[PDB]
């Protein structure tokens, strides 16, 4: 299996699924290094973020647990097709990249927070992560290039 991918069994149905312990992605389907990647992200900050503030809210006070519930709700809406990643990043991301539908542009190793970097490079083009935790808060990351 590609880097970071492992086999598990669903608790509710018993069926085999695959999850990635670098990107926190999980999916039923069996899965399948560049100098640079391009990603977008949606960040939900919480009270222990390095800076607990954003363009959305001057004082961010939600707990880490409440941030993670939000992130999980947005992942659900994205995977169901109810909402697009870009539309939710523009409305809800706690980072000024929201004004570019979450786009960060292209970057190499050695530039972003390390868990964000590792998740970004472990995604294939087009793939989306699960919740990815960094000092800034919790991200959903979409690799676009």
Curated annotation (Swiss-Prot):
Pfam families listed in its UniProt record: Rotamase, WW
Gene: PIN1
Presence of keyword Acetylation: yes
Protein name: Peptidyl-prolyl cis-trans isomerase NIMA-interacting 1
Subunit structure: Interacts with STIL. Interacts with KIF20B. Interacts with NEK6. Interacts (via WW domain) with PRKX. Interacts with BTK. Interacts (via PpiC domain) with DAPK1. Interacts with the phosphorylated form of RAF1. Interacts (via WW domain) with ATCAY; upon NGF stimulation. Interacts with PML (isoform PML-4). Interacts with BCL6. Interacts with FBXW7, disrupting FBXW7 dimerization and promoting FBXW7 autoubiquitination and degradation. Directly interacts with RBBP8/CtIP; this interaction depends upon RBBP8 phosphorylation.
Residue list for modification Phosphoserine: 53, 90
Domain PpiC: 34-145
Coiled coil: none
Tissues of expression: Expressed in immune cells in the lung (at protein level). The phosphorylated form at Ser-53 is expressed in normal breast tissue cells but not in breast cancer cells.
Keyword terms, alphabetized: Acetylation, Cell cycle, Cytoplasm, Isomerase, Nucleus, Phosphoprotein, Rotamase
Function: Peptidyl-prolyl cis/trans isomerase (PPIase) that binds to and isomerizes specific phosphorylated Ser/Thr-Pro (pSer/Thr-Pro) motifs. By inducing conformational changes in a subset of phosphorylated proteins, acts as a molecular switch in multiple cellular processes. Displays a preference for acidic residues located N-terminally to the proline bond to be isomerized. Regulates mitosis presumably by interacting with NIMA and attenuating its mitosis-promoting activity. Down-regulates kinase activity of BTK.
Residues annotated as domain WW: 1-32
Effect of residue 28 to A: Loss of binding to phosphorylated target proteins, including to phosphorylated RBBP8/CtIP; decrease in DNA repair of double-strand breaks by homologous recombination less efficient than that observed with wild-type protein
Reported modifications of this chain: Phosphorylation at Ser-53 by DAPK1 results in inhibition of its catalytic activity, nuclear localization, and its ability to induce centrosome amplification, chromosome instability and cell transformation. Ser-53 is dephosphorylated upon IL33-stimulation of dendritic cells.
GO molecular function: beta-catenin binding; cis-trans isomerase activity; cytoskeletal motor activity; GTPase activating protein binding; mitogen-activated protein kinase kinase binding; peptidyl-prolyl cis-trans isomerase activity; phosphoprotein binding; phosphoserine residue binding
């Amino acid at each position: 299996l590609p880097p970071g991918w492992e086999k598990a069994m669903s608790r509710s149905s018993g069926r085999v699924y695959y999850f990635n312990h670098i990107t926190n992605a999980s999916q039923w389907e069996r899965p399948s290094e560049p100098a640079r990647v391009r990603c977008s992200h949606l960040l939900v900050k919480h009270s222990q973020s390095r800076r607990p503030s954003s363009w959305r809210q001057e004082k961010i006070t939600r707990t880490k647990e409440e941030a993670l519930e939000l992130i999980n709700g947005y992942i659900q809406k994205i995977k169901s097709g109810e909402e697009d990643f870009e539309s939710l990043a523009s409305q809800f991301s706690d980072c000024s990249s929201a004004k570019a539908r979450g786009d960060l542009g292209a970057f190499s190793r050695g530039q972003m927070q390390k868990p964000f970097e590792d998740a970004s490079f472990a995604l294939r083009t087009g793939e989306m992560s699960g919740p990815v935790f960094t000092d800034s808060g919790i991200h959903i990351i979409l690799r676009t290039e």
